[model samples]
Target: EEASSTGRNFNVEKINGEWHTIILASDKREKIEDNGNFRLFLEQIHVLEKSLVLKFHTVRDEECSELSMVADKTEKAGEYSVTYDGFNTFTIPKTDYDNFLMAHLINEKDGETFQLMGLYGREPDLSSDIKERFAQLCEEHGILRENIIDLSNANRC
Candidate 1:
């Protein structure tokens, strides 16, 4: 399964003993609406089920929020929901986990808004490598981690 700037594709096995493809409409229908800049695109691939979900985040230096693209499926699937309220807590099947991580890293280095805060699970704990890399990126981008806290605390702002 692949999800890109174009759209998402799903290959599925039919219970009736057949296989098929499900194509979801690309969110890029309007070029003006494509806020690809300052957003991260995440594709969660479910290996066992051969399904995928595409998601995005609207992030600026000061704040961030996520949104799940309304996807179409070959089977009747309901809205995709994040199990946790914080960033990066959704689970993709274990089989495709490494690829997902690598994809996010590549996007981050390419100047996409793949914030470290949004890449790891909601908990504060992060691997040493990720921690080092995130700190470096934050410095490079001039995104003060301390400032983020202040902004969050300032309700009126």
Candidate 2:
């Protein structure tokens, strides 16, 4: 089974629980920008105790695309892998893939990009345990912790 978004395509094989990101060359950045060309971006894979996480980060230009894959189940214990057999393209004018960065620049806001990308995961039953473990991971990475507020609470015109 598989599901895809605009300019991004992926496939999941149930046999070995392996998820392959097809359309590896799909330039979602340019596609969203209406450029209609494919460009290489950075890809990462993270392994947790029960599942694997594949992250693709976009790069500026002119180079080989880097992809990373994580294959441990402990780090992603409760997250269920969702598989669908169709493509989902979001059509929002001028709200391209880079909007997250743009929003931050325009308003010093965070979380907008994650929200826009539908990247928010539900708090799992092991939330407390995971949170503590994640905090340690952040500490190792020199990351500072911060809270996220619901953007909808802010006054909007």
Candidate 3:
């Protein structure tokens, strides 16, 4: 199936709310491992005039800490730029807004490139249809099923 069109077609209004980290996948496995950079549990999204705020939780040293990050919205509806571990271009390639959201992350750090995928939802769990859709989307980006990880059972913030 063709990927859903983002950019102007995206409804930014639907993204403002709390969300759960259902699953994550990355070409670099370490990025989604236990305390990896891409292993964050999402908490909420706030849409601003020209920026977006993300509140999330990350586990480290056997504890969970809440953090907030800001992303500047690009000219496109579903794209944003934020500096964290590196220069990151975050894009929402797929989302129904009410049920699930799929994000694609590209990071440029120390002259190397890395890619990550996040599957988020309104709840801690999702239907099999959503999981299957995520699998397909990950494959389209060269990430395989083996790399996808489930975080639904993890402790909440």
Return the TM-score for each candidate structure.
0.25, 0.23, 0.92
> Between prediction 1 and prediction 3, which has the larger lDDT?
3
User: Which of candidates 1 and 3 reaches a greater TM-score?
Assistant: 3
Predict model 1's lDDT versus the native: 0.28
Clashing pairs in 1: none
Off by over 4 Å in 1: 1-67, 70-117, 121-125, 147-157
- Candidate 3 lDDT, tens digit per residue, 1-157? 2233265556676789989999999999899999798799998999887888999999988789888999997776567999989999888888888889899999999999989999999998899999999999999999988999988888485
RMSD of every candidate to native, in Å, equals: 14.4, 17.8, 2.3
- Number of colliding residue pairs in each model: 0, 24, 0
* Predicted candidate 2 versus true structure: per-residue lDDT over 59-127, tens digit per residue: 333233344444332232222332111212121111122111001101112322111111111111123
Per lDDT, the best of the predicted structures is: 3
Q: lDDT by residue for model 1 over 14-104, one digit each (tens)?
A: 1111111111011221211224342343323332233344454444454656655332333323112222223222221111122212111
Best by TM-score: 3
Candidate 2, residue 111: lDDT: 26
